[PDB]
């Protein structure tokens, strides 16, 4: 026979392999496909869809419908944050369970821009202005309107157009970020504050809630496939 030589790796089984192999059922009449609406080409396009963020994860609210609700009030103006959030899409509890994040859990590196959309679900007679803020990492995490106002931010007016989107632009030292909670690859801080305050007339519910959604932008990508840790089998 043709003189051949075995080189390293022969006989091994790498699960990530891609070769041809003999068929178990030759000449099997495969059933042709039909146009089933809604086919997906890549995982990222699921990522670009906006999913609701379980913000308030307090002992009482966690694992309950309420964790998706962020209560607002008509209290006089304060410079205190409404909600604080870390830019660790794949590792911070609040982001970790959104489709975006869940997806991110299947990869090791993440890169690109993200968008935060907020939905006011109070009454029509309710008015207000807010400041949603994204501060790149490295400094003191914002906790007062003041410092947050210095970073990237959208000032949102409550009105007929029910929702507002703030885009967190890709600002990173590295070409790709870690799916883990890490300092070198830290993402920054996301924060919401009252610009004015919530104002309602009489005979109007004084306290309301807000919904938040997060998704990827057309230039978001992930790499290095790994197994997730949000799933497991005991014995």
């Amino acid at each position, epitope marked *: 026979g043709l003189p051949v030589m075995n080189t390293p790796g022969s006989n091994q089984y790498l699960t990530a392999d891609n070769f041809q192999s003999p068929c178990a059922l030759p000449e099997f009449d495969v059933t042709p496909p039909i146009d089933i609406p809604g086919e997906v080409k890549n995982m990222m396009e699921l990522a670009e869809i906006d999913t609701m963020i379980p913000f308030d994860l307090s002992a009482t609210k966690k694992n309950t419908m309420e964790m998706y609700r962020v209560r607002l009030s008509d209290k006089p103006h304060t410079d205190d944050p409404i909600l604080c959030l870390s830019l660790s899409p794949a*590792s911070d*509890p609040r982001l970790s369970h959104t489709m975006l994040g869940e997806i991110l859990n299947y990869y090791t590196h993440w890169a690109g821009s993200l968008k935060f959309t907020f939905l006011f679900c109070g009454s029509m007679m309710a008015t207000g202005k807010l400041l949603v803020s994204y501060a790149p990492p490295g400094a003191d995490p914002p906790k007062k309107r003041k410092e947050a106002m210095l970073g990237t931010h959208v000032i949102w007016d409550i009105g007929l157009q029910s929702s507002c989107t703030m885009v967190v632009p890709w600002i990173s030292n590295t070409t790709y970020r870690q799916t*883990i*909670d*890490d*300092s070198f690859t830290e993402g920054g801080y996301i924060s919401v504050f009252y610009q004015t305050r919530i104002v309602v007339p009489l005979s109007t519910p004084r306290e309301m809630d807000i919904l938040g959604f997060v998704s990827a932008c057309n230039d978001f990508s992930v790499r290095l496939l790994r197994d997730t*840790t949000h799933i497991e089998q005991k014995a």
Partner: nanobody
Amino acid sequence: QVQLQESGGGSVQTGGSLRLSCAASEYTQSSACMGWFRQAPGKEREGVAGISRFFGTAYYADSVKGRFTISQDKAKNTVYLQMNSLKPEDTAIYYCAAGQGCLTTIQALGGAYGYNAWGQGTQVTVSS
């Protein structure tokens, strides 16, 4: 994160045994040497005990060797801390400390520097 949830605040007298435990169920780059830090409101926060994730690299602070030992359950996932013969000098708030990438507790061996996930805090009083 990992899960870090600790308890065990029993104000025992001087010379009794106390057990401290911190959850570490989820398996991230898991708590290597782990970490136990006590903050004495007279002093500040300081490192104490720590056994490597897999290996037997357990570092002990000068003040607690022999009396205080570290061990865990490589399955049930929780980190135990046997603190016996308690002095009144050990009255402080303890904390567990996840040091991820094992090398974090191989290079420096002890925790403190390579520690990203912080525990809750349990008050332990050892009085007369």
